[PDB]
Amino acid sequence: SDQEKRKQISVRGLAGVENVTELKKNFNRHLHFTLVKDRNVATPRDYYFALAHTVRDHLVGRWIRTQQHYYEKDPKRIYYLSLEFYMGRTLQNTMVNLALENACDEATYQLGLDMEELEEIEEDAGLGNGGLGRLAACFLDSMATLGLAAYGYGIRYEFGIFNQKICGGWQMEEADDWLRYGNPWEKARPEFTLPVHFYGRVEHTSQGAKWVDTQVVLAMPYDTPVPGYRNNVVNTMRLWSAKAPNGGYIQAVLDRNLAENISRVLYPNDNFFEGKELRLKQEYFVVAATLQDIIRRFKSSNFDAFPDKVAIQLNDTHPSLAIPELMRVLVDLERLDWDKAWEVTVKTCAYTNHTVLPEALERWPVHLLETLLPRHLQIIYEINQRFLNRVAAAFPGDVDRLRRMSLVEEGAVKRINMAHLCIAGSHAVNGVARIHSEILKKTIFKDFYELEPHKFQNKTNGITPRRWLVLCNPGLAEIIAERIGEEYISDLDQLRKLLSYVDDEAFIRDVAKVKQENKLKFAAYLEREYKVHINPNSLFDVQVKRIHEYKRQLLNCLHVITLYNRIKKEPNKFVVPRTVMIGGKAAPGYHMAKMIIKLITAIGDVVNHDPVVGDRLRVIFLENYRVSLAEKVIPAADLSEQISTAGTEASGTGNMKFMLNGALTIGTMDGANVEMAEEAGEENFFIFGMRVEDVDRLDQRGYNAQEYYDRIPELRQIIEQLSSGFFSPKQPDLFKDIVNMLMHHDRFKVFADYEEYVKCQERVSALYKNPREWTRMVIRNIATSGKFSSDRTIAQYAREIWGVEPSRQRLP
Amino acid sequence: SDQEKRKQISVRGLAGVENVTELKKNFNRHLHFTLVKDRNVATPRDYYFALAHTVRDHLVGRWIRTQQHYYEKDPKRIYYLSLEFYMGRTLQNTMVNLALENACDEATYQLGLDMEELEEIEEDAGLGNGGLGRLAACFLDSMATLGLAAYGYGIRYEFGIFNQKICGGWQMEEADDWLRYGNPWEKARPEFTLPVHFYGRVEHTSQGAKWVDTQVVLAMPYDTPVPGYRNNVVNTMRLWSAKAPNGGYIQAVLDRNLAENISRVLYPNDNFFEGKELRLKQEYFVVAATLQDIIRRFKSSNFDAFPDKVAIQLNDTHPSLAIPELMRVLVDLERLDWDKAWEVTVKTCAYTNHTVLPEALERWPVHLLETLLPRHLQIIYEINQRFLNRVAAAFPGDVDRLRRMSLVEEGAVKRINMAHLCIAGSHAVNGVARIHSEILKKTIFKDFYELEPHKFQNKTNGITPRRWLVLCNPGLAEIIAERIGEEYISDLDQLRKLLSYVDDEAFIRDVAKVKQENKLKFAAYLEREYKVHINPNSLFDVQVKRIHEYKRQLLNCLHVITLYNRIKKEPNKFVVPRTVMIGGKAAPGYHMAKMIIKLITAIGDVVNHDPVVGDRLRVIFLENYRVSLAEKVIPAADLSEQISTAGTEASGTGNMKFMLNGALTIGTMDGANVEMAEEAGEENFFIFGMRVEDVDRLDQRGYNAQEYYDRIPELRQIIEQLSSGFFSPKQPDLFKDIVNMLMHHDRFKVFADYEEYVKCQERVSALYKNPREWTRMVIRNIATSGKFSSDRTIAQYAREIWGVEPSRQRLP
């Protein structure tokens, strides 16, 4: 009795068995009881929510069963700490991974509703800037699919990356109010709310140190379910929200906004460090709450065993304060000896590096750290002293090495090198692509690689075949399925078997048919939503990624102006029609990035209206590039632009998405491009330009852009056009900053790769002229894209860093 | 087909038929799917939410059916505009009105849960300061119960009235974060979001005037269901929330908080005007959005008919901008002639006055109005000019009358008298108690009553018998029910029939038994929650209401010190044991109110620890008085203190609650006390002190507190104790401001009513000494409390102001 009567309360029976009748029944229940509406007043958005709640209900039993499972079994837990999780939309993904897509599609059909229309109502959960943010998302999906006891931990931003609008040809930022109509996926957990401390001071009492007189900010966690692919595993992504703890009364209540501002906006910087105190607060905020929750879970089914039960993966140095914080907790609060604590910390943390550009790495001024986090600075100084002691003993006499390896950067404004803090406090440091990891070992982290070689590894990036194939390209996924089955969805290497079809006329016809369907669908979408007309029988040339000088959208710009100038030169000469699409967001304070967007639209303004050009060349800027737009444009792409200066793009992931969806690649030997070319065969790739060794040689003697300008007539013509106002009649000097940079301050040597890039593009169009051969080369690409699935990347992280074994065994 | 297939989507079948099996089934469903939890980790709060969602589901069909009904039938609609709705808790109330209380009680029993415990988790929706806010709430309940097509319209405050804490004997304010764990009762309605304009300027174009260059703030509505008593009617309370429309990017996103601050906190002023611009914004905010929604609904099933279809009731002058706003819309936007528009407006609006104190009435400086609402000020000036033209024609030559009646108050700081704007723009003005309405006609609104007698009415206040009897005193409700049935719950006049039992020994025994049960339960609650010990066999003397000088808690203080001094004087003389309880909140900036709370605790500090006093007298301050505490302490009260200075308390409603729950009343002939004494018979009341005419006579010759001090030795002793530090040893002069006010600046003549109050209290204890006679007098009170049910008040408003007929006919 009594407590035995509570056994009734169980998940036991849900919405049935996963079919049309019960689904309709539940959609209906949600529309009336959850949305408090009826068919006469229900809005399209209401229907979207009704469907989303019905689908979400199917996650619950699994979600509860999975967490119960980890509690019972008690496996080692993996914690992915990141300040970004670029999740995109959740509805379709959930349906696909739960195998409910068809049933929901039919149930919504019988209720007279269009599921595709409804899916379009959901907006992106854009809590990320780009690559690094999307990687965390793909990683969450793969860890679930591989049955790992993994937890994603981040910040629940009220405003994700800004929604970009184009006005007058310029980018305009708009707050991304994604939580306006609520979020049907998350579930707040008040009872796990935790306190995070700031400022204050340190007093050294008999016992040890004490952090006193601090300002408190509460951290309320919101859980979002992350379903693996058809294995009945539902993992959790826990995002923290800032809440005030509990000039006059009114102002005091209005001032609660100050403390809650911590989780207000995602800083829109991609590959760029901005030392704003509010960002430092966000970083400490996610770290402090996360570590408390991790230790709680550890204590609930001493610390010697911590590393055998916990793995903390730092996505970049953003959550690096986890190192000194874990030490603070173990030493100050748990009272362990420093060295035993340090052993535990190193064994627990591992650091992932995503870039080699100096301006993209974190170096916090010590004055900012001493006032905001006084005891963390003290602990960092002690970590530094003991680390420097070790290198000094390993390399006696080498004082300059000590200076280079120090966690503290002396100078006008003393700063703390966070990357150095991470290497010292992690048992594994990793690059995200073979070439990148090697560059780390030879340049920026060389001193560290020499002191601790065992620490450095590589983990080439990947993307999830679920969202990036099954989800976004059903057509491609089905034709691949009719030939080889469905086991590839969680074993991408099986795509290899498609090589056996390279000379199969049916498959060759099908690959091309799927592509043109996608091209047609994308063209329809652009005309409907933006009233933009694009020629579907043109080659879709696409460069989508954040706007950057290192990504060289400018090089792409030089090429399209070349294509235009050549056409005007010889109007009646045939050219492979092209629709050149460039999309991506610029960071608010990045002037050159904003000028590049303006140059792109400016070029289009001339190119797109020249009668002699007509249907032959069209240049368009894809506004507001985000995960959901990627899922639309990537599958309709013919040519994938991956032209960063060799040695600058650590890996890239968009490159992999384009390859998986049937596009041929034109790029440099940079990042993962190297490994992708290796996988498909350089003969099936369009690699061009300088190699890393080539830019290094140019650096040794000095890069003189004038040389290339004096030697290339076609290049001179374009700069002359830019400078004279040909692309900006009403404001002739509009692009003088672009021209000046290119001519005298180009760190990314655009002119040095111009000629080879233009020639390589000539060969791309030569191949496109032969559909049969273009398609056969495409098949050889898709068939070798298997190594780039995040399931592979994750399995390596698991076996070589976390010390846990992946698994595709389903739960009941 | 197609659109005929959507007929399936219907409310048709819900959670069954209203019994235990289906209720358990649904509680369970909600716990797993809505809270995403299971019995092993569910917290008590989770269970509370599970139960609340299950109950809420029963509201939906009715809620949808009711609104559909008003749309089909299209009755005249009544709009109750108020800046406060003191709703208290919703769970029990909903269960009671839907007749689900017993079933939920049993279903939660079988699931091993304690419903009472769970109900205690819900916190008050304290969006009100006191009387005026509670009245709107009681009114919402009665309008539903009387089948009126009524809509409550207000602001969804993020923070209601502050939670009061007592520290060191002083009040400490704490933000009331009532939406922290979410609100299971409300349902946001994004699609009805509306724009509200501020600042800007006015330009007079050919056509007419135009309000241009304004700052926009969006208004998002949240609906809360309000169920009538067992008639299947569910009306709506629509509360507006402020949302920003869509120094750098980051700061710009952080600055969205500024516009959303409008709906952040309820100003904690009770009977006091504070001219803060943020308050003016809140007032315009609720008015502008509300009027747009009202006109939308009007247009969707010309303006001549507006008054036949719309009634706008202004709760005080808070939403008075509705008058100039309705004119702005009709003239500027709908292009109607001024006079036809004015006719429509007056016929549509009616104003309710709640006080006569000058400091409690709204007078907005014109500079504040010209910058924030430039065209409203222009319209107010035109309304003034035309109104003054009418009085001038009605009273030729009377220039001083024009000056007194003007909507504009000249002087150092020109201001707009909002009460005057309301009378001019309403077809009915009303006081809230017979004596109050008459005072309006003879003093403050005299000039207006002389120009338009037909306009002035009275509508004596009431309280709802559902929440204030059935809900809070089940014991009393059941014994009354065993004698006369249940029809009284929506026909309170039937309580009259209990007079037939005044000499019935069973009923007499039962009334006293119910009271002592409540006294016992309250004593248990105070010891559990506050570790406060009170003697259950003492007479519970209670004064709960906001702390004010006009309410004279100080007079009550003088009495308890008298009781103490008399006991110390003659220790061995018998006295009726008393537990004097005083509770209520002080406005943050009201110094005297805060000193009074401190004096109360100070007195307790001495009284409660004197060994010779022992169990005989105990003085306690009930911390954080709010609607849910009222429901607990009022039913356990023996003596209800209603001692405001005659002519100051417009009505009062707590007085009525105490009468309905079996407490005898000690008070002045003020507000509704007059009508309550009339109903039960003054012989069954404890009326004392000066009457209105008596304070007026004192005012004519001058109030000299020194006279009373020189003539009353016992009074002199107390002031001497206060002044010397007897109640504040460590800070002797702590209460010098209280003493100084009483001696020389008492606008409320406390000393003038001291002697009569003390004697009247002697007679109260004389009666208490005789339980049988105390109880019989109590019966005569409860039996005549019927006129004070808000159902009566509302029926009068309906028939004499709104022009609509009440109805108890149930819906299916």
Ligand SMILES: CC[n+]1c(C)c(C(=O)OC(C)C)c(-c2ccccc2Cl)c(C(=O)O)c1C(=O)O
């Ligand atoms: C006690 C063991 N856990 C478990 C079986 C959980 C569960 O049943 O979760 C389901 C409702 C999705 C879960 C959990 C526990 C308490 C409140 C809320 C959650 Cl969410 C967690 C966690 O920290 O999140 C567990 C853990 O490990 O501490």
Ligand SMILES: CC[n+]1c(C)c(C(=O)OC(C)C)c(-c2ccccc2Cl)c(C(=O)O)c1C(=O)O
């Ligand atoms: C079209 C007629 N109305 C009606 C039958 C309603 C209804 O079915 O509401 C149910 C979901 C609780 C209701 C309504 C209409 C559209 C969206 C949301 C609501 Cl809530 C209202 C309103 O303004 O609130 C109506 C009105 O009058 O305009």
Ligand SMILES: *Cc1c(COP(=O)(O)O)cnc(C)c1O
């Ligand atoms: C995959 C992805 C990225 C990363 O693209 P790269 O070309 O590797 O820089 C950026 N943004 C979005 C929306 C993505 O989907």
Ligand SMILES: *Cc1c(COP(=O)(O)O)cnc(C)c1O
């Ligand atoms: C009824 C009520 C009031 C009004 O009380 P009066 O004594 O009429 O001023 C104030 N506060 C609360 C919580 C109430 O329930």
Ligand SMILES: OC[C@H]1O[C@H](O)[C@H](O)[C@@H](O)[C@@H]1O
């Ligand atoms: O590692 C994930 C991604 O992180 C960053 O955004 C890098 O610029 C990119 O090259 C890398 O692919």
Ligand SMILES: OC[C@H]1O[C@H](O)[C@H](O)[C@@H](O)[C@@H]1O
């Ligand atoms: O009208 C409702 C209430 O409004 C105010 O709070 C008055 O002080 C009170 O007397 C009245 O009862």
